[PDB]
């Protein structure tokens, strides 16, 4: 259902599947270690709600039976938030752009035990795409390939040829674009060897995490929970 | 698990 | 001064570049802790080797001594998985860790049948020695790249290599940029398995499992 | 660092 689809059908898609950026708490009141990331768990568990609406208007996804969806979400869902974030941050230069009312930088993460590391990685990811350009039809691309490709491994035949699609629709943005030949598989190449950051950014961050339940209180959403325990 | 009962509706 | 150099030219300069497959101290006459501990073993041969290794990946000795560290010690677990993988495509369901060490997921569980996952992609795929030596020098440029651009130059260099390699297999333009897309999502799964393995080796010094004093400071290297 | 020594030669 899926491969029928036109590189141009394919996009659009995509485009039109968009998830919603969603707002913080609106009390302007210098942060804590609780507070902080009370926020981010706070709008993390209100933004997987539509991811998951989201993962189910990706194109190939509805395919996969239930369980397989579960999986590629359980595995993907904080890589994905992650060049969300990264992605909204590419305008504001050593920002990160956790909601419109939510611009951090680096200096309040380090009221965050180890959270400058992960701050870090994450604006250098962010300056990365600006310096590349990365175009909204390229990014839809991306995260859509990171929820299919990053618990593909773990378990399918069916994701692969959807990957490939994914691909010729990259290429064919890439072509749009004036790209030559050469600048295409090249440009193609520097847009997924990002991912392996975005995978170590979500290893790093997950661990994070996990600390984070064993110190009890920042309460984590139980949906979070059940996401975080699949690791 | 909560997850399936989002990926259902 | 490694960037006027031809596809051909990159493999070869590559392929010759390899490092020897190493043995363990495997006798089975002894009878599971001992595993780790040839694992531990064979891993601190190969560092050395690896060191050694790449020295010959073009581009890496333009890089200055401190960003050869660094690139080494966020890639070398990635770098000795790949090759484990590599080694053990022709062994279906089996870790060919070393020639005389064939281990399967019975004789941590998890790793070990990501990196059997990993081994049966590539079978699959029918990747070419070629082909792994410039995902190898890929990984070793790229892991630690985001912590000039004369790195970024180089790997594009390594691109165009694969690019021509599939070019040369008889693939089509889009079957070219296909494969050049699988293999590099492949990465993110060696990513994975390397954080995953980090941190299992994380906890196995802590427990005593005995490590190598160079692992030691590569292990320390991710904190 | 060992890693700095082998590198150097
Ligand atoms: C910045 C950061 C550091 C460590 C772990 C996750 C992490 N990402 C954030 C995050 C990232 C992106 C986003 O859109 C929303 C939240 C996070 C924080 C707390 C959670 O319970 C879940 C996600
Ligand atoms: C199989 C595995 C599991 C967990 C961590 C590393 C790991 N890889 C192995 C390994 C992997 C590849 C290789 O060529 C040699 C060793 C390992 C085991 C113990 C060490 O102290 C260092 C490396």
């Given at each position: 259902?899926?491969?029928?689809?036109?590189?141009?059908?394919?996009?659009?898609a995509?485009?039109?599947?968009?998830?919603?950026?969603?707002?913080?708490?609106?009390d302007?009141?210098?942060?804590?270690?609780?507070?902080?990331?009370?926020?981010?768990?706070?709008?993390?568990?209100?933004?997987?709600?539509?991811?998951?609406?989201?993962?189910?208007?990706?194109?190939?996804?509805?395919?996969?039976?239930?369980?397989?969806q579960?999986?590629?979400?359980?595995?993907?869902?904080?890589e994905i938030?992650?060049?969300?974030?990264?992605?909204?941050?590419?305008?504001?230069?050593?920002?990160?752009?956790?909601?419109?009312?939510?611009?951090?930088?680096?200096?309040?993460?380090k009221?965050?035990?180890?959270?400058?590391?992960?701050?870090?990685?994450?604006?250098?990811?962010?300056?990365?795409?600006?310096?590349?350009?990365?175009?909204?039809?390229?990014?839809?691309?991306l995260?859509?390939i990171?929820?299919?490709?990053?618990?593909?491994?773990?378990?399918?035949?069916?994701?692969?040829?959807?990957?490939?699609?994914?691909?010729?629709?990259?290429?064919?943005?890439?072509?749009?674009?004036?790209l030559?030949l050469?600048q295409?598989?090249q440009?193609?190449?520097?847009?997924?060897?990002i991912?392996?950051?975005?995978?170590?950014?979500?290893?790093?961050?997950?661990?994070?995490?996990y600390?984070?339940?064993?110190?009890?209180?920042?309460?984590?959403?139980?949906?979070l929970?059940?996401?975080?325990?699949?690791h | 698990?909560?997850?399936?009962?989002?990926?259902?509706?």
């Amino acid at each position: 259902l899926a491969l029928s689809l036109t590189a141009d059908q394919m996009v659009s898609a995509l485009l039109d599947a968009e998830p919603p950026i969603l707002y913080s708490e609106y009390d302007p009141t210098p942060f804590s270690e609780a507070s902080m990331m009370g926020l981010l768990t706070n709008l993390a568990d209100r933004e997987l709600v539509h991811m998951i609406n989201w993962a189910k208007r990706v194109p190939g996804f509805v395919d996969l039976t239930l369980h397989d969806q579960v999986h590629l979400l359980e595995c993907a869902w904080l890589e994905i938030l992650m060049i969300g974030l990264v992605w909204r941050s590419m305008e504001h230069p050593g920002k990160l752009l956790f909601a419109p009312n939510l611009l951090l930088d680096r200096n309040q993460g380090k009221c965050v035990e180890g959270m400058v590391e992960i701050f870090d990685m994450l604006l250098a990811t962010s300056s990365r795409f600006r310096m590349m350009n990365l175009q909204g039809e390229e990014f839809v691309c991306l995260k859509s390939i990171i929820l299919l490709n990053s618990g593909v491994y773990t378990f399918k035949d069916h994701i692969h040829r959807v990957l490939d699609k994914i691909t010729d629709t990259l290429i064919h943005l890439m072509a749009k674009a004036g790209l030559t030949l050469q600048q295409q598989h090249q440009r193609l190449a520097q847009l997924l060897l990002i991912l392996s950051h975005i995978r170590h950014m979500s290893n790093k961050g997950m661990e994070h995490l996990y600390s984070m339940k064993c110190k009890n209180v920042v309460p984590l959403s139980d949906l979070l929970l059940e996401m975080l325990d699949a690791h | 698990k909560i997850l399936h009962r989002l990926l259902q509706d």
